[PDB]
Symmetry: D3
């Protein structure tokens, strides 16, 4: 019954994202891991690559459905009949930004309830942004990524 | 799916009602659990707070109000809850919530903390603020359930 | 006597800005709503459009004067003989950024006193930035904008 | 244009003087209002705090020091104030200020809260910090008006 | 190079051990200084806290545990320390630390405050949190040195 | 014995940076003021200029060594045998960002200990970013810069 959506750019998907989506699947019947098709800034990985990586990294998770979407997240959520909006809150999260976002999304689709989940301490201080930047500059980020993502990232930067 | 929404609720305000209502639309059963919290010298006794919360949530079918004095995590496990509801206001209280969340996770890893956001209308209120205003005879009718406002007025009369 | 300046990019002006400038006109004799001519990033609306929209949205406000300015805000403030600097503080404001800004502006023009006003709860969680982005991506933002701004925004995005 | 600058001022520090001075350059009349705040067990009695503040602001012509024990908003309305002055330090206290501001706005919508920023010199001080240092005989001369420093030394002698 | 790591340490936790260990790898000698802090009504007496800290840091060769009741800055000067160690958790406590740091700098400008960051494992714990959990018989073995856990259990038995 | 590294873009070096590096030299034997060679966004001053300005501004400081570096800071730190990483924490610092950074750097090089120092109240509210922007827009920033930097900045903007 309960359909939740966990949207983001997932460029690329990290262990932190896997942590959050796993917790979400434990409390909700169906979870749609929604990948933004055209983010403001050109992503490192194409939508096709991001969807493929996300699908493989969540293949073990039954009620998780990876899908790409363009335009407004809220519009996609409504057409997908989602009533729960999953947001991951790391310890280094811009909380005020999350409040802005949740209130705008509530204005757009009040039937979509924002719920914030907390990752393990292990992934509470890292972001996809930092991971990409360290990787681009010759730093080891293997620890923060699913094996399939790690391999794809090495190919991408080579 | 059973969730527990713990707190001091001294007293339960419209903000708490907002959060628990959102919780009921998301989970099958919601246990509003009131901690004795003797160290906080609550204005209302646990018995009074439970009664107030019960009446204030009488219209919510899947809400159960209970009081407890033990470790919240043990009470949660004993109530068969797997979701722990917390409300996050327009304040940077987020820091304290993470400490509590991680401690509870250490005590009961299967109890998943979930944070809900209240409406803009109740984003700046707290039981403490309402009590302070009422102690100085200010009008707090707007922030409390009718039965709770009556109880607060009488308590300070 | 008391001349205040309420500067910004106002791209476009929103109900939150109207809320703040209205509160300012209630405590100060004359309020100059100053619109930055050339913001770092290309604005959605041209200075001409932004000034026109702001003028119409504040026409009902007597002691409000809409004016465009280039270069340093402090230099404009000084030449305009303003002694009060209005800053709106939303609940989702980057407070540390506001402190940086106020201290720099104080260094530049100590005779200009920064004063922070708080908008109603209704407009405390939205920014012009979020509004534009939601609008650009097919979301309903009518609620946050004066009617004239709403009409101009639809034309702009069409 | 009458403004009210409320607070516990226990004791009034150079930081408070900085804020009230900025207020006087902006508004015609400023009422520095000291709350009894019995629940905070102030170091100085309300009478002492008023006297200290009076002397400390004697040089400021448009400042009036008064004490009060009622609801701040009612006192403000009764003082004919339409501006409520609050100081914001280099701390994220901003959150608490919004709660207070919105409650006061609910109690008296025409009382407009305005936040002023102190100089860098006083951006990290508080009455609480000064008292803690003085309780351990540390030199706090730099942070307090001459009359206040004298009173604090004598109070702890 | 002598550093002082002051605190209430009521009780010293694995988080404190993490911070003091990082300090010893950076400076020649580290003085773990425990403040009497009577105003905080500590669970353990200063004597008990010193003993607990001593045992908990026995393996750290360049750490010296001492208690004090005077102004921290004077104690630091009297201990010949020129570095003041403070731990910063995953919380926005940073604000309070700046106030303390600037006051101590005013009292003793040559005492340089330095902030260290604990491991992720101890980034959300505090003495207060551990005591609260233990008061409700929750398992806090994971967060405390063996000797400290024993003392806490006995203290609450 | 103790070798510390104080990395940044220093574009340009300011009195706030001088404050922090001076405090660092007082507690550590040798301090390497490391200047990032190619920051994401094109710096105002070239690496050559930034190194020259930094060297002159710290010439009076004995145990300070100004050096440029490219790629990962952690990789440079390791090859330079640094065991202490100096970070300046202003009152207007994005603390959560600093935590993200310190944990990533710890992951990369655990033997490098992050230490945060606090500048004087005088430089606690200003950033290189704000200084450059005010200067670019005709504002007086002489107060925040060493004399040599001030002169170079005027030439740069002329
Ligand atoms: C689509 C969506 C779910 C994607 O989520 P996302 O990957 O987290 O995207 P974000 O842009 O927020 O990036 C995340 C991080 O970027 C940073 N960030 C992004 N915009 C920021 C801003 N304006 N200020 C500060 N930080 C910002 C933050 O650090 C943030 O993480 P945090 O809150 O935990 O600290 C989210 O953008 C959304 O719900 N957008 C609303 C409007 C919309 O529908 N998108 C446009 C349609 S194409
Ligand atoms: C001119 C001025 C009044 C315009 O105000 P403005 O529209 O609010 O412009 P800002 O760039 O601050 O944009 C506002 C929001 O952008 C964001 N922002 C801008 N720069 C940011 C930064 N460096 N870090 C984080 N957020 C930033 C913040 O979220 C901010 O809002 P908030 O503090 O409430 O959370 C202001 O820029 C100013 O006083 N500038 C000082 C220097 C100057 O004179 N301008 C240059 C002359 S051309
Ligand atoms: C190299 C390094 C030491 C330079 O330091 P730096 O000059 O301070 O660079 P930053 O990008 O952090 O710029 C500083 C300010 O920019 C702002 N900033 C930068 N990235 C930001 C982000 N993602 N979100 C918000 N603010 C950000 C912050 O305000 C910050 O200051 P603050 O924390 O006190 O408030 C630092 O970038 C580092 O340690 N990077 C890790 C990865 C690396 O090795 N660099 C890539 C190799 S080329
Ligand atoms: C009551 C509460 C949920 C805090 O909520 P509050 O801030 O709404 O009063 C918390 O103090 C609690 O869980 N108390 C029970 C005792 C306990 O288990 N404490 C450890 C919590 S980690
Ligand atoms: C005194 C003060 C302004 C707080 O200021 P303080 O932090 O400087 O002590 C506030 O506690 C107050 O207004 N007290 C009077 C009683 C009251 O009306 N309280 C409700 C405030 S919303
Ligand atoms: C003990 C401590 C370092 C605070 O640490 P804590 O938060 O770990 O208890 C501080 O309260 C202190 O320095 N106490 C001694 C008395 C004193 O000098 N106070 C003024 C500090 S500026």
């Amino acid at each position: 019954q309960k359909r939740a959506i966990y949207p983001g750019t997932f460029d690329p998907i990290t262990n932190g994202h896997i942590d959050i989506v796993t917790r979400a699947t434990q409390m909700f019947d169906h979870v749609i891991l929604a990948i933004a098709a055209s983010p403001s800034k050109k992503p490192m990985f194409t939508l096709e690559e991001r969807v493929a990586l996300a699908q493989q990294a969540t293949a073990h998770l039954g009620n998780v459905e990876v899908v790409g979407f363009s335009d407004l997240m809220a519009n996609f959520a409504r057409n997908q009949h989602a009533t729960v909006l999953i947001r991951g809150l790391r310890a280094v999260a811009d909380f005020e930004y999350e409040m802005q976002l949740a209130h705008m999304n509530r204005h757009l689709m009040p039937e979509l309830e924002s719920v914030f989940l907390m990752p393990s301490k292990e992934w509470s201080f890292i972001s996809s942004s930092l991971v990409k930047e360290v990787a681009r500059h010759q730093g080891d980020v293997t620890h923060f990524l699913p094996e399939n993502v790690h391999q794809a990232l090495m190919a991408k930067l080579a």
